[model samples]
Target chain A: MKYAGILAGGIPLPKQFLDLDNKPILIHTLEKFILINDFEKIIIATPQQWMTHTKDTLRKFKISDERIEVIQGGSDRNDTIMNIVKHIESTNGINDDDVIVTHDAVRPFLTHRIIKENIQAALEYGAVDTVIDAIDTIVTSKDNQTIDAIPVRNEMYQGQTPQSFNINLLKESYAQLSDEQKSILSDACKIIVETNKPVRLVKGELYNIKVTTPYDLKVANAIIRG
Target chain B: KYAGILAGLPKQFLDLDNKPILIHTLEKFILINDFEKIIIATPQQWMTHTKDTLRKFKISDERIEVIQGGSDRNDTIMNIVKHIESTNGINDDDVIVTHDAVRPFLTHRIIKENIQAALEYGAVDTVIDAIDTIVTSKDNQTIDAIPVRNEMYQGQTPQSFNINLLKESYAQLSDEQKSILSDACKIIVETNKPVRLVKGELYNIKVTTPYDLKVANAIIR
Candidate 1:
C-alpha cells in the first residue's frame, strides 16, 4: 500500500494555512496529491490546535476524497512523520515494501513528475530525497565569525521535499537514532543517511519552493499569477 | 568613477515585461545617480547584444559602459577594475559595487548602504539571515555539521569594496588562493580584513532559473 504524508504542523499560523489565490497553501498542496492515483491514503498532519480548522478548510475547499485523512500532528517535522506512520500502521498496516511519500504542506508547486519519481525511486532504492543544485556559493562558519570551509558548489544541493521512504526502512532507521542524533535532525533524509543508508536523489524544480516567509508568499502569489 | 560591475551571464538579457533583466537592474542603480559609471561585464559574445539591448530600451546614459567579462567571477571583477585603471585611474576613495545583473529588485537603500559600508569598512557583503538551518558535508553524502541558524547567512550582492583595497588584496593572493576563489569577499577575508555584512532584502533575488524568471515577471507586475 502506498501512502502520502503532509507535514503541516509548526507555528500558530503556519504558512501552510496562509492564503494564496483564494485557497490555503495546504489546499493547493493537497490538490496535487489528490491527483495521484496510486496512494492508498493521503494523511494530513496539522497542529492539534488547528485540526478542526484544517478539516473545515478542507470542507470549504470541497476536498472530500475518502483517501484524505486529517490527524493531529506532533511537535516537530519528524515527529509528525512518525505520527502519520503510526496512523498507517494502526489503520492499514504497513508492509515491508510499502512506501510513503512525505512532503511539506507549504510547497504547493510540486509537479506530478517529482511525486511520481519520488515514489518510483523510494520503491527501488528504499529511500529518496528531492533536491535542486545549489545556485549560491555555500560557505560554512563553525564559530559563526569566521569561514570554516567553502564546499565545492557543484557538489552542493539545496534540498526540497517529497522525500519518500520504504515504510520498514524509515521506521527501522529512525528508531536506531540516539537521542543526540535525533536532536540535530534538520531533514527527514538526514535520518536515513545518518544510519549509513543510501538515499537516492531526484531532480527537483526551482519553482517547487517551501513558502515559509512573507516574501516567499509574495513569490508564491507571483508564481500562481503566471 | 568607482563603477558598478554587472556580473554573471546573458541571463541578464532574459526578458521581463519585454525589457531585459539587465536593463531593469541598471535602471535601479541609474536612479540612485551616485555611481560614477555602471560597467556591465558579460560574455564576449554577449557584449554587442548588451549594448544593443541598452539602446533598444532607450538607456543612453554616458555613465553606462559594457565590457567583456573574464573566465570566472573574480576575474570578471578584476577585468572591470583594470578597465577603470586603464581609462581614468582608480582613486583611494573610489569604491566598486559589484552586483548580479539577474538581481533586478535591489533597492536604492541596499545599494547606498553597500557603498557607505564599503567606504567605512573597506569591504562589505550584503547578506540575509539563513531562514533555514545550513548544513555542511565535506564528502557531500552525510551531514558533517549543522551550524547554528542564528549565525548562518545567505550571501547576496552588491558586495562592495574599496577599489585600491580590492586591487591590493587581489595582487596579494597566492596561486592556490586564486584557484579556490569563488567570492570577492573571500579575497578580503583571506587577507584577514573585516568584511562587514549589510542586511539584504528578501525580494532582491537572483533570477537564475526559469521559475525565478516567472517570479521576476510577477514582481514587476
Candidate 2:
C-alpha cells in the first residue's frame, strides 16, 4: 500500500505548538496531506503526551481518526523512523516496490504537485528527495574563519522533503546503519546513501519552510496572511 | 544608489517609515555611542541629490561627513578608505565596519558584536548559519556533493576590521590586485590572515530585488 508518515515529534519543541493562522502548525501540515488524498495509509508520529493534542487538532480540522493512524514517537529522530519502519513492516510486510513518503509536519506548505512528483519519482527511482535550486552563493568554512570554497550557485539545491523511498529498498538500507550512525544522520536519504543507493529529486517551493523559530513563525504568518 | 528591482526609486533612497533606507542604516550606528565619525561616500552622479536629501532630512552636519564616491563599488570603498587615512588622529587600531548602504535593517547587535569580534580577532565577517542544505552541481544541473550544513555560512556585511590591518592589506595590493578582488574581506582571506565570524541577524538583508523590497516593507513597519 502507498503510505505516508507525518513526523510531528517536534511538537514538544519550542516552536511547533504555536499556531499558524488559527490552527496549530502540525494541523496545517496535516491539512495538506489530508487534502491530497493520495495515500492509502497516512500515519502520524508525535510524542506520547501530545497524542491527545494531535487527535484534537486533527478533529478540529474535521479530519477523521479512521483516516490516519497516530503513533507515539520514539526518543529521537531515528527512533521515530524505526517506529514507522516497524509499523510498515508489522502491518504489511515490506513489499519490494511499495512506496513510503516521510515528511516534516512543521513544513506545512508542500504543494500537490510536489507530493505527486515525489511519489512518481520514488516509484521510478526507488528513492527521492524534494529540493529547490539554491538562489544564493553558498560558501563553506573549514576553520570557521575563512571561505574554503564557493560552490557554483546553479548546482546547489536547498533540500526539502516528502522524502519518498521504496519499502524494500529503504528497509534493507535502514538495517545497515548503526544506532550511532542513525542518531547523527539528519536526512533520511543519507542513510540509503550509506548503502550506496542513489536518491532522485523532486522540485520544491520556497514557502515550504520548517517553522522552528519565532522568526520562522513570523515569516510563515506573513506569507499566510499575504 | 542601487537599482532596486521592486521599486522605481533607488533602494538606498526608497522610503522606509517616511525616512530613506540609508538613514535607517545610519540610525542604528547613531544609536551606538562608540563611533567618533560617520563618513558617507556618495556616487559622483548622485552627489547633488544625496546632499539635497541629507539637507532636507536635517541630518546633523556635525557628526557625519559626505564625500564624492567613485564609479564602481570597489572605487567607492577605496575613496572612503583613503579619506579615513588622510584624516588626523585616526589610529590604526580603530575598528571600521564596512557595509552596504542599502542594508538598512542591520541590527545594533550585529554592529556591537562585529566591533567586539574585530577588536579581538583583528578582522571579522558577519555571517549566519545557512538554513538550507547546499548541493554542489557537477554539470551545473545535477547534484555532486552536499556540504555539511554545520560548516556552511551565508555571508552578510558590515565586515569589520582594524583600520591598520585593512589599510596595510590594501597598501600591499597592486592596482591590478585591487581590481580583481570582490569584497574588502577577501584581501585578508587571500593573504592567509584569519577572519573570525560574527553571527548576524536575519533582518540584516541587503535591498536588491523586488522580492527583497517587498519583504523589507512587510517587516519594516
Candidate 3:
C-alpha cells in the first residue's frame, strides 16, 4: 500500500494553512495528491490546535474522500512525520514494501510528474529526495563573516520536498538516530544518509517552492494566476 | 550581458507592469545620488531599443550611458571598465557595481552597502542565507556532501569591485580560466582576495522566467 503524508505543523497558523487564491494552501497541496489514484491513503498531520480547522478546510473544499485523514501532528517536524507513520501503523498496518511519500504542505506547486517519480524512485531505491540544481553559486562561510569555500556551482543542488521513502526503511533508519542526532536533523533524507544508504535524487521544478514567508505567498498567488 | 534568448526574449526587456524590467532596476540605482555613472550594456541590436526605452520612461539622466555589450558577462563588465578608462580614466578610488538588469526588487540599502563595502574591502558580493541544505553531487543521481546549511549562502548581484583591482584580477586570469568563469567575485577569490558579503533580501529575485515575471507583476500590484 502507498501512503502520502503532508507535514503541516507550526505555530500561529502554519504557512500551509494560510490562504492563497481564497483557499488554504494545504487544500491546494492536498488537491494535487487527491488527483493521483495510486495512493491508498493521504494523511495530513497538522498542529493539534489546527486539527479541526484542517478538517473544516477540507470539508469547505468538498474534500471528503475516505482515503484522506487529518491527524494532530507532533511537537517538531520529524515528530510530525513519526505521528503519520504511527497513524499508518495503527490503521492499515505498514507492509515491508509499503512506500510513504512525505511532502511539505506549504509546497503547493509540486507537479504530478514529481510526485509520480518520487513514488516510483522510492519504491525502487528505498528513499528518494526531490531537488533542483542551484542556479546561484553556493558559498560556505563557517563564521558568516568571511569566505571559506565556494563549492562548484554545477555540483550544487537545492533540496525541495516530496522526500519519499520505503516505510520500513524509514522507520528502521529513524530508530537508529540518537537523541542529539534527531534534535539537529533538518531533513528526513538525512536519516537515510546517516545510515549510509543511497537516497536517489528526483529532479524538481523551480516553481515547486515552499511558501514560508509573505513574499512566498505573493509568488504562490502569481503562480496560480498564471 | 543577459541575452536570455533561451527564455524566448531578453528578461530585462520583459514587461513587469507598465514599464520594462530593466527600467525598474535602473530606477533603484538612479535614485542613489552618490552613483557617478549608470552604464547599460546590451547586445548591439538592442542599444537603440534600450536608449529608446530609457527615453520613454523619462530616465534622462546624463550619467546613464548605453553601450554595446561583449560576448559574455565578464566581457561585458570589461567593456564597461574600458569605457570608464577611456572616458574619465579609472582612478584608484573608483568602484564598479555590476548587477542584473532583471533584478528590479533590489533595495537602496543593498546598493549603498555594496558601494561602501567595495570601497572598504576591494570587492563585495550580495547574498542571502540559503534556507535549504545545499547538496553537492558529482553525479546527478547521488549526494556527495551536504554542507552545513548555516554556512551556506546563495550569491546574488550587485557584485561590486574596485575599478583597478577588477581590471588587474581579470588580467591575472588565463584565457582558459576566464572562459570557465561565471561570477566576477570568483575572479577576485581565485586571486586570493576577500569579497565581502552584503545581506540581500528575499524579494531581490532575478526575473528570468515567465513565472518570475508573473511574480514580479504580483509584487508590483
Candidate 4:
C-alpha cells in the first residue's frame, strides 16, 4: 500500500534551527520519517518564506530531493495540514485506499513501534490517533474559579500527532467540518471527531514530545544526550 | 496512596538517584529552617521500614516523627492533624503544609509561596500552568471537552492551610463528603472556601509512573 508522511511545521522558531547533536531540530524529525521504509514520500509544510530555507536544510541533511516534497504552509497548524492534504489530492501516485501520516515537525522521538501501530490502526479502523494516558488528574472548570469536575484520570489520554488517516476518508471528513469547528480544533483528529468518525488509538510515547518552548528544547536535548 | 502504576513498587518508595523517593521529598522540607517539626505518614506496615530508612540516612529522631497513615490520603492527613493538635509546639494558629511523598522535586520557592499564600488566604494549593491541551473524556479515551489551556492549571502539592481553620472545616465535613473525596484542596472546594493558587515550577513534578522516574532521573542529573 502507498503511504505519504506530512511534516506540519509553522514559521521557524530559533530552537528549530538550533543544533541538536549538530543537526537542526527539524532535521532530527525529518530523519525519523526518512528511516521509515513504508512511507514512499515525505511532504513538508512550512511558511512560504522558509520554502527555500527548508529545501537547503534537506540538502544539508543529504535527504534525496526526489524522496521528499516541500510545500508552502499556512498560518496555523490545521491550515498547514489542509495545504498538505490539498497537495496530496492534486498529486497522482497516492489513491483513496492509501494512508497519510500527519506528524509534528518538532515531535522527533516517536519510535518505529508507534508509527507501525498508527498505520496499522488507520488501515483497519479508517482513522487513528496516538495518545498516552494522562498521568495527572485533569480538573475542569467553566469559570476557572471553582473545579467543575475532576475527570477520572484513568479515562483520560493526551492526544499526540502522527494522526494517521486514509487520504479519501480524511478529505470527506474535512469537507463536512464548518468554519467554527475548524477554528476550535488544533489537531486533525478533532476535525474527524466533529464528523462522527471513530479515530482508533495507538499507545503513545512520553519521550515523543513536541519541542515548542525553551524548556522543551532543553528536555529534547537531554533525551538525545541520554 | 496506591500507585500500582509501576510494576511492583509503590510510587513513594521508588528510588530517585541513590535514596527512596519519599526521602528526597522529605529532605527538601528538612533543609528549611521555617518548619519546626516534620511528620511522615506512611502505611502501618511500612512505618518500621521508613524509620529504619531514615536512621540509615542519618536523620535525627528529634527532627522527624513517624506516624501510621491510613489507607486513604484524607485519612492519613487527618491522623497527622490529630497528632499535631496534641503536640505542644504546634499551635492552633500555626500553618500545616501537606505534601506528596512522590513529588520529590519541589523547590524552596514553592514551599515559601505556599506558606505565604496559606497565611494570607487560609487555604492554598500550588499549581503550574497546563502545558498540554486539557481534555475531559467520558469514555476513558475519546475527548468530551477541551478546556481553554490558558485558564487551566494542574494542581501540585505543598498545599498549605491554616491548622485551626482546616480542623474546624474537617469537623464540619458531612459523612458523605468524608467518605468520598481524598484530596485536601477538594475539601476546601466542597466547603465553599476559596483556595488561593501558589505558582509552582514545572520541575516540581509528581513521580507517578516509570516515565516520571525517567524524567526525574534526567532532571536531577
lDDT of 4 by residue, B114-220 (tens): 77777787887777767665545667545565556566667778788888778777788974687686667777777878777777787788888777887787677
Question: Sorted by DockQ, highest first, which candidate order results?
Answer: 3, 2, 4, 1
**Worst 10-residue stretch by lDDT in candidate 4 chain B?**
B1-10
lDDT (Cα, tens digit) per residue for candidate 1, span B3-56: 565656468878988888888898888887788888998878888888888899
Q: lDDT tens digits, residues A5-105, model 2? A: 88886544535567878878777777678776768778898888888877877787777745598898887765687688788788877776788889988
Model 2, B1-221: lDDT tens per residue? 00111111567898766888887777776777677666778766666676678788876645567777765665666677677767644475777777788788778888888888878887877877788665554554334566677898777877888877776787787666766765566667766678788877766778777656666776675
Ranking by TM-score: 3, 1, 2, 4
Model 4, position A220: C-alpha lDDT score = 79
**Angstrom error at residue B102, model 4:** 2.1
Highest lDDT among the candidates is held by which one?
3
List candidate 3 stretches off by more than 4 Å. Answer: B1-9
- In model 1, residue pairs whose N, Cα or C atoms come closer than 3 Å (at least 3 residues apart or on different chains), thus clashing, are none
Predicted candidate 4 versus true structure: per-residue lDDT over A1-226, tens digit per residue: 5455555455445445667778888788887777778886688887787778888887888878466898998767777777777876677545757888888777878878888887888888888787777755555555554455555566667677788888788878888888887777777777777688777777788888878776676677777766
lDDT of each: 0.83, 0.73, 0.85, 0.73
TM-score of each: 0.86, 0.85, 0.95, 0.84
Model 3: per-residue Cα lDDT over A1-226, one tens digit each: 7899999867567788788889989999999999999999999988778889888889998998789998998877787888999999998898988999999999999999999999999999999989999967787788776677777888999999999999999999999899988888878898888888888999999889899988888888888765
Between candidates 2 and 4, the one scoring higher on DockQ is 2
